[PDB]
């Protein structure tokens, strides 16, 4: 069967298991989202932030 | 001519576009509920459906085809004969106190 | 043909008052939409008016064939006596048919839906909720007959009252939430209906659908061997008590030879019962109750009836 | 108040499906869009003109305000 | 057995057709609860004295860990808290909910109770437009005969806005929202005796629905979009609705060029600047608000909504333009083009409400043979 059906049978069926997914998702989401977001901002503002220039003054 | 103007206003209002009649729309009021209570079951049970259908339309923000819209000449005043009776009863109660 | 045409139209007007029969007919209409099972046995009054002799000769010449049929009996006779008459009489049946004369049955599309026939003029409210069933031959039918039997059934004439075992029946007799209810499992060729029927005052529905669904989800999560054992002993007696008389026995023969192909003796039913315990019930009910899309039906002052998303909301727990 | 005795209704039927058995976005673009334009033309001539009138008095008042401050 | 009261949030009968316009009633319940949490955390670092207040905001906006976001979720958390009203009210007037007199007259009492609270709240940063705002606007009560010279000095706690004027606003400000929260639960109480209205104005007892899965998630949506338009301003244009002269500390000996309240009062202010007679200007100001309490006594159409009242629709959306005008005139200075406009619009506001809109439904009845 599809993946969606496999996900439901294991995770979204039991509300106990369900909730643990959400916490687990948040952790890897919290990590992944912050890395990707910063990369965009830095890429836009490349060479304008402190760390991008900090090497010159150590 | 005024009749043509009454007709245009009716279509402009648009409660024909929801299949309603005029008396289906009147403000719920003490003199009115009395009149509604006196309706027969056939005419009443039709009023309820004309309303409950219309609400089901405005929820979906839709209307009916032109074939089902209420026609101006067909705008039945089913409630006024009973309502004008009630208001007459009210003025007697007031006049009797005076 | 024209006399009985008038009679059957008179019967429908009578069956318009048998509120119970209406609900199941409304129920099958919604569970089994777009399929034959949505139809009634009696069909619409239109076809009753628009029928012909030709339509019947087609129906009879098509379906009544010996292979699809069964003769069976019970009582003070002998098998061998029955054969000598079958060959004498039933040897003449059309035991054959054209290349594609006999149809076959495909599975039918269950669906999750609701039908709410509002009629406040009538004093009581019939309700019926159910789900998709296994079918006849599916073995977990046995376990479910227990599960229904745990819930049991009730009328306002039963003198047990509060002291009954089914906590649904106990509560209902206490608080007078209802006048009646029951638990059915209709079994079709490869599917069926599973649920319950109940009657109650228009100011008492919401309390029933909150306790009824609770007991289902109770079983899906936690049921004890004692009450399962209580249910098993009921299922034993029902099969035995149902088989008392030459008539219901040959019924059990006839349909079982059509549904299962053979008959099952009570020894084998007991053997299938014996393999039941609490673990079986938790699983099977979890397959067919827990977090499913049921069919719902109503007839009468059903204003208090929870909307289907609330019914469906209660088909699971947050536990 | 509560459900059950709010009013009286008779000979009315409702049919409904389970949301898990139907799409949440049926004909979302195919049918929804002209309904909007239909919902738009039905009312727009009653909403527009005072705001249309506003934009003019906004500019005309703005320009005349400017010209007042300039010189002879 | 509280949660029989939660049936007003779960098993409550509600109609089926109601569109987004009704969500603005709930959102105030979010803004209010949102704003209280923010303004509280501002109290932790605010000082009610004149020599320390303006800096205290700086302590927040500079040295505190994310103190700055809270200031702007809170200031602009008041602006959005009045976009919500003015649409929450316009519903009540356009769809004709004002027939629930008990609620409406309390709807007014919530409005005033608020729209003075922002006035007090705008002082607390203690800048120019804060001070001079309060200096001008309190003096209007001086126009009243035989009292005003006594009452204004009393409110000030002195003879001009000074320390004790500030410190008491901070206390009148950080309390009334807890009084507003009461009146809301009151305001709902008389609503849950009648149940809400629909676009049609028709009794919806037949097509009611619960509230737990349907409008809840609808309010979760509508609340989410609100948090967008708030945080956009906080994260993309925080000085937009502000006024930069506020970021100069108060100087009572240096009047700013443009004195004005913030955008959400200005239509009131334009009405005042329209009239030259001072006292007569005031009674117009208070009447521009209190006129809401005269609406139901001016209901004339035997219908309720305005989906089915064409002429009133055209007049209604004209009233909105008159408001938007008055919002604009008040923000702009006082000169011969804008004086003339500000006079006409203000006359329309009272004229249109009292005369035309009643007159319309009378006419509309006549066409329907009523
Ligand atoms: C309920 C209606 C309220 C309205 C209309 C309102 C409005 C305002 C406005 C517009 C400001 C100006 C802020 C600025 O310009 O930076 C302000 C300041 C302030 N508000 Fe609110 N507010 C309300 C409730 C509250 C509540 C409930 C609290 C605390 C729990 C609070 C605490 C403050 C404080 C301490 C200030 C001064 C600090 C500062 O402005 O930086 N306010 N209020
Ligand atoms: C702190 C301020 C307020 C709070 C907390 C509040 C809260 C609410 C809520 C949650 C509702 C139900 C949703 C709705 O019907 O739209 C409501 C209804 C209503 N509000 Fe308020 N509101 C406030 C301000 C106002 C104001 C200022 C007015 C009038 C000037 C008003 C007039 C009404 C009316 C007439 C209704 C009922 C209308 C109907 O149900 O058709 N409210 N209020
Ligand atoms: C049918 O119209 C009505 C009728 C009666 C209503 C009523 O009696 C109340 C109390 C309210 C209400 C008032 N404040 C706040 C909320 C709220 C809703 C979702 C939240 O959840 C989150 F998503 F976080 F915003 C948080 C708060 C709801 N709304 C009514 C809307």
- Does E have 3 or more CB contacts under 8 Å with A? no
- E219 flagged as catalytic: yes
Residue positions counted in chain B: 98
Task: Report yes or no: E313 and E361 within 8 Å, Cβ to Cβ.
Answer: no
Domain with residue E212: its CATH number is 1.20.810.10
Does residue E118's CB lie within 6 angstroms of at least one atom of ligand 1?
yes
Structure letter (DSSP) for residue E202: S
Q: Which atom of ligand 2 is nearest to the CA of E194?
A: 40
Boundaries of domain holding A36 = 1-58
Is A15 within 8 Å of C291 when comparing Cβ atoms?
no
Pairing of strands C113-119, C125-133: unpaired
Active site residue E196: yes
Q: What are phi and psi for residue C298, nearest 5 degrees?
A: -150, 150
| Direct distance between the N- and C-terminal alpha carbons of chain A, in angstroms, rounded to an integer | 59
Q: Which of B14, B45, B62 sits opposite D11 (nearest CB)?
A: B45
E240 is in which domain, residue-wise? 1-370
Work out how many domains chain B is built from and give that number. Answer: 1
- What's the Cα-to-Cα distance from A55 to each of A38, A47, A50, A52, E93, rounded to whole Å? 19, 12, 9, 7, 64
Closest CA to C238 of C285, C270, C274: C270
Q: Cβ–Cβ of E213/C306 closer than 8 Å?
A: no
Of C252, C285, C299, C269, which is closest to residue C128 (Cα–Cα)?
A: C299
Q: Would you call C318 and A15 a contact, using CB atoms and an 8 Å cutoff? A: yes
Which run of H or of E encompasses D14?
Answer: strand D10-17
Resolution in units of Å: 4.1
- Cα(E50)–Cα(E353) distance, integer angstroms: 43
Kindly give, in sequence order, each residue whose CB lies less than 8 Å from that of residue D59, ignoring residues fewer than 6 positions away: none
Ligand nearest to the CA of E196: 2
Coil, strand or helix at E275: coil
Q: Which residue in A has a C-alpha nearest to residue C319's C-alpha?
A: A15
Surface-to-core class of residue E341, CB atoms within 10 Å of its CB (0-12 exposed, 13-18 middle, 19+ buried): buried
Query: How many domains in chain E?
Result: 1
Query: For residue B71, which phi and psi values (nearest 5 degrees)?
Result: -90, 145
How many domains does one find in chain A?
Answer: 1
Closest ligand 3 atom number to CA of residue E29: 14
CA distance C209 to C197: 11
Sheet containing C154-155, strands listed edge to edge, beginning at the edge strand earlier in sequence: C154-155, C180-187, C192-200, C125-133, C295-300, C113-119, D10-17
Q: Please, where are the H alpha helices in C124-277? A: 141-151, 167-175, 205-221, 225-242, 246-259, 266-274
Is D1-72 in CATH node 3.10.310.30? Answer: no
- Furthest-apart CA pair in chain B: how many Å? 53
Q: Which helix (H) or strand (E) holds C115?
A: strand C113-119
Is residue E192 a known part of a binding site? yes
State the residue range of the domain holding B31: 1-98
Asked whether the beta carbons of residue A15 and residue C316 sit closer than 8 angstroms, the reply is: yes
> E218 an active-site residue?
yes
Cα E194 from chain centre: 25
What's the farthest any 2 CA atoms get from each other in chain D?
A: 81
Contact call for residues B41 and B11 (beta carbons, < 8 A): no
Q: Which residues pair with C133 in a beta bridge?
A: C192
- Residue span of the structural domain in which C290 resides: 113-316
Contact with chain D for residue B62, Cβ under 8 A? yes
Backbone angles phi, psi at C121, to 5 degrees: -65, -25
How were these coordinates obtained?
cryo-EM
Nearest Cα to C190, choosing from C132, C250, C248, C120?
Answer: C132
Cβ atoms < 10 Å from Cβ of B75? 18
Return the CATH number at C257. 3.30.830.10
Is the distance from CB of C309 to CB of C126 less than 8 angstroms? no
Mutate to test the pocket of ligand 1, among E119, E124, E182 (most ligand atoms within 8 A of CB): E124
Chain D residues inside the 8 Å CB shell of C301: 4
Residue E179's closest CA among E105, E117, E98?
Answer: E117
User: Which of E11, E19, E192, E203 is the catalytic position?
Assistant: E192
């Amino acid at each position: 069967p599809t993946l969606t059906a496999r996900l439901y049978s294991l995770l979204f069926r039991r509300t106990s298991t369900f909730a643990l997914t959400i916490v687990v998702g948040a952790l890897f989401f919290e990590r992944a989202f912050d890395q990707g977001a910063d990369a965009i901002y830095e890429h836009i503002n490349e060479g304008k932030l402190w760390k991008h220039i900090k090497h010159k003054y150590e | 001519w005024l009749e043509g103007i009454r007709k245009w206003y009716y279509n402009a209002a648009g409660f024909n576009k929801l299949g309603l009649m005029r008396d289906d729309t009147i403000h719920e009021n003490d003199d009115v509920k009395e009149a509604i209570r006196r309706l027969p079951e056939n005419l009443y049970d039709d009023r309820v459906f004309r309303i409950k259908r219309a609400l089901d339309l405005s929820m979906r923000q839709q209307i009916l085809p032109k074939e089902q819209w209420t026609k101006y000449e067909e705008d039945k005043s089913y409630l006024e004969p009973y309502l004008k009776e009630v208001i007459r009863e009210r003025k007697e109660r007031e006049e009797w106190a005076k | 043909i024209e006399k009985e045409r008038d009679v059957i139209l008179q019967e429908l007007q009578e069956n318009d008052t048998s509120m119970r029969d209406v609900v199941f007919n409304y129920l099958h209409a919604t569970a089994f939409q777009g399929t034959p099972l949505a139809q009634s046995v009696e069909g619409p009054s239109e076809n009753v008016r628009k029928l012909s002799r030709a339509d019947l000769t087609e129906y009879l010449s098509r379906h009544y064939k010996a292979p699809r049929m069964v003769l069976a009996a019970a009582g003070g006779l002998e098998h061998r006596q029955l054969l000598d008459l079958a060959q004498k009489h039933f040897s003449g049946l059309s035991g054959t048919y054209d290349e594609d004369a006999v149809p076959t049955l495909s599975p039918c599309r269950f669906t999750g839906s609701q039908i709410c026939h509002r009629e406040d003029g009538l004093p009581l409210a019939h309700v019926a909720i159910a789900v998709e069933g296994p079918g006849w031959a599916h073995p977990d039918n046995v376990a479910l007959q227990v599960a229904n039997a745990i819930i049991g059934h009730y009328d306002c004439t039963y003198g047990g009252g509060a002291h009954l075992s089914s906590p649904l029946a106990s509560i209902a007799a206490t608080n007078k939430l209802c006048q009646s209810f029951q638990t059915f499992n209709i079994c079709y060729a490869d599917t069926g209906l599973l649920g319950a029927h109940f009657v109650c005052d228009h100011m008492s529905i919401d309390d029933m659908m909150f306790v009824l669904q609770g007991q289902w989800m109770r079983l899906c999560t936690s049921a004890t061997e004692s009450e399962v054992l209580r249910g098993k002993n009921l299922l034993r007696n029902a099969l035995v008590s149902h088989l008392d008389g030459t008539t219901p026995v040959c019924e059990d023969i006839g349909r079982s030879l059509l549904t299962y192909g053979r008959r099952i003796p009570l020894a084998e039913w007991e053997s299938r019962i014996a393999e039941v315990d609490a673990r079986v019930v938790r699983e099977v009910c979890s397959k067919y109750f827990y977090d499913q899309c049921p069919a719902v039906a109503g007839f009468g002052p059903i204003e208090q009836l929870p909307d289907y998303n609330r019914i469906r909301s209660g088909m699971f727990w947050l536990r | 108040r509560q459900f059950g005795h709010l009013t009286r209704v008779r000979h009315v039927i409702t049919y409904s499906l389970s949301p898990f058995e139907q799409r949440a976005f049926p004909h979302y673009f195919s049918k929804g869009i002209p309904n909007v334009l239909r919902r738009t033309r039905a009312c727009i001539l009653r909403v527009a003109p005072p705001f249309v009138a506003f934009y003019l008095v906004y500019t005309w008042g703005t320009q005349e305000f400017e010209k007042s401050k300039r010189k002879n | 057995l509280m949660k029989i009261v939660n049936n007003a949030f779960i098993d409550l009968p509600a109609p089926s057709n109601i569109s987004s316009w009704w969500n603005f009633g709930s959102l105030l319940g979010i803004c209010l609860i949102l704003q209280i949490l923010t303004g509280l955390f501002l109290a932790m670092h605010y000082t009610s004295d004149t020599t320390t207040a303006f800096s205290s905001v700086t302590h927040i906006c500079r040295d505190v860990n994310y103190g700055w976001i809270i200031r702007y979720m809170h200031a602009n958390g008041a602006s959005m808290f009045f976009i919500c009203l003015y649409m929450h009210v316009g519903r009540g007037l356009y769809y004709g909910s004002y027939t629930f007199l008990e609620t409406w007259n309390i709807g007014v009492i919530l409005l005033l109770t608020v729209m003075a609270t922002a006035f007090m709240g705008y002082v607390l940063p203690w800048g120019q437009m804060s001070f001079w705002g309060a200096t001008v606007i309190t003096n209007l009560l001086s126009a009243i005969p035989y009292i005003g010279t006594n009452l204004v000095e009393w409110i000030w706690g002195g003879f001009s806005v000074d320390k004790a004027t500030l410190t008491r606003f901070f206390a009148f400000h950080f309390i009334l929202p807890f009084i507003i929260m009461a009146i809301a639960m009151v305001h709902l109480l008389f609503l849950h005796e009648t149940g809400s209205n629909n676009p049609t104005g028709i009794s919806s007892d037949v097509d009611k629905i619960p509230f737990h899965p349907y409008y809840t998630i609808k309010d979760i949506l509508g609340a989410l979009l609100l948090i967008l338009a708030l945080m956009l301003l906080v994260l993309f244009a925080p000085d937009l609705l502000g006024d930069p002269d506020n970021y100069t500390p108060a100087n009572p000996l240096n009047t700013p060029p443009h004195i004005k309240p913030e955008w959400y009062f200005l239509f009131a202010y334009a009405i005042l600047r329209s009239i030259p007679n001072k006292l007569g200007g005031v009674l117009a100001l208070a009447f521009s608000i209190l006129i809401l309490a005269l609406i139901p006594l001016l209901h004339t159409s035997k219908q309720r909504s305005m989906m089915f009242r064409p002429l009133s629709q055209c007049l209604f959306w004209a009233l909105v333009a008159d408001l938007l005008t008055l919002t604009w005139i008040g923000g702009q200075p006082v000169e011969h083009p804008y004086i003339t406009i500000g006079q006409l619009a203000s006359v329309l506001y009272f004229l249109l409400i009292l005369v035309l809109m009643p007159t319309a439904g009378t006419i509309e009845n006549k066409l329907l043979k009523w």
